[PDB]
Amino acid sequence: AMAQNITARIGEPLVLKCKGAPKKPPQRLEWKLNTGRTEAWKVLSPQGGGPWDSVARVLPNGSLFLPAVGIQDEGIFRCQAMNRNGKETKSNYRVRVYQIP
């Protein structure tokens, strides 16, 4: 149980790198985040996109960029992976916007 303290501004673009994929070819990957209501949690795939794809995309280097991080983006983000044996990456980042409700 942990989390990194990161300050952000509402409507301001933010970029972060979420490594994890070993040296082997592009393996599976799953996106998960814990929040009060949770409305950003989306399923990321190496071949396909969803709704969150329009809200935020992943760079070829395994990064993450958001056009404008708002209150909905608040909360804590977490990365995870799925290998043949079931290997997952543990990491939680705490993100908060300037003006809050």
Q: Are 9 and 100 in contact (CB under 8 A)?
A: no
In angstroms, the CA 20 to CA 46 distance is: 14
In angstroms, the CA 24 to CA 31 distance is: 20
Nearest one of 31, 29, 34, 30 to 3, comparing CA atoms: 34
Residue 74 burial (CB count, 10 A): 21
Q: What is the CATH number of the domain that holds 17?
A: 2.60.40.10
Residue 69 burial (CB count, 10 A): 21
- Domains of the chain: total: 1
Q: Are 3 and 45 in contact (CB under 8 A)?
A: no
In angstroms, the CA 10 to CA 31 distance is: 22
Structure tokens at 65: 């960029």
Nearest one of 69, 34, 44 to 55, comparing CA atoms: 69
Domain residues for 43? Answer: 1-101
In angstroms, the CA 73 to CA 18 distance is: 16
Instruction: At 52, give phi and psi (nearest 5°).
Output: -60, -20
DSSP class of 60: T
In angstroms, the CA 90 to CA 79 distance is: 7
